[PDB]
């Protein structure tokens, strides 16, 4: 059940989801790559306090992710689904969907990330005080960015990334499988009618988001247990409630 003009339907739904939940478009992002921060400015970075940079890159991860939800809520069959099984599915998949859509905001001439209004590289994140976590995103997205994403392919991609059936604790597992079947076919689909099916074999190993994910939470843990304060006064309630309801609030408009 679904024929070919069915799965062709859900290609575009998905890719009109994906356009409109956009955080910024893609050609501002390309317009902005010569708006490099200087040596003066990534040192100001650099030299900030490791709490500061903390909060700001929490902040910007937020912001980010409320943009995932909004993706989420229009992407058909989600908000069919019960309330226990989005709120599985956007905090499992939220991060991994953040961190894929990175890639449009990198330029891997350069190996720099658009950040607050300009491109810079990894130095720029030295004051958080982990570079194995930095180095891991940074390569995670140069690796994507040699697939050469087409913003229907990443609308594609992410919706699977998202609707994931074998996330611990859903309570209509069958539910999901069927949502997530029928974007498999919609994404494959489209890679065939494009002539696109050689990225299938060098996409990412489902192990490597995962990864990325554990190396934020355990961080972050280290991070909480040294500033315990700064995470309950200043980080944002939908980081803490994510990674440490908001939720509920955004998925009910
Ligand atoms: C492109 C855009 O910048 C948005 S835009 C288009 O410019 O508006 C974006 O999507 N950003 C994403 C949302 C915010 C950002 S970031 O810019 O602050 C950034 C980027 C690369 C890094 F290596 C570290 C941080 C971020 C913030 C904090 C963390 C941490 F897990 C970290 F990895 F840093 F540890 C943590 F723990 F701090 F939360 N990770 C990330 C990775 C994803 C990006």
Known sequence: MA???????????????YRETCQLRLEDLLRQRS?????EEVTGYQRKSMWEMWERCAHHLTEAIQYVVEFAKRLSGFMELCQNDQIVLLKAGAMEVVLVR???????????????????????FRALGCSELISSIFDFSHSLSALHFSEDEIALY??????????????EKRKVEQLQYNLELAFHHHLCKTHRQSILAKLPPKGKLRSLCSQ?????????????????????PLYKELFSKILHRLLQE
């Open 216 to 236: 934020h939470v355990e961080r972050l843990q280290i991070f909480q247990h040294l500033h315990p304060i700064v995470v309950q006064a200043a980080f944002p």
């Open 158 to 171: 992410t919706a699977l990334v998202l609707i994931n059936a074998h996330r611990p604790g859903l309570q």
């Open 35 to 39: 708006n490099i921060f200087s040596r």
């Open 102 to 124: 990175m890639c449009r905001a990198y330029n891997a001439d350069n190996r720099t990330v658009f950040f607050e209004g300009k491109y810079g590289g990894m130095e720029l």
């Open 3 to 17: 024929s070919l003009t069915e799965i062709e339907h859900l290609v575009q739904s998905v890719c009109k989801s």
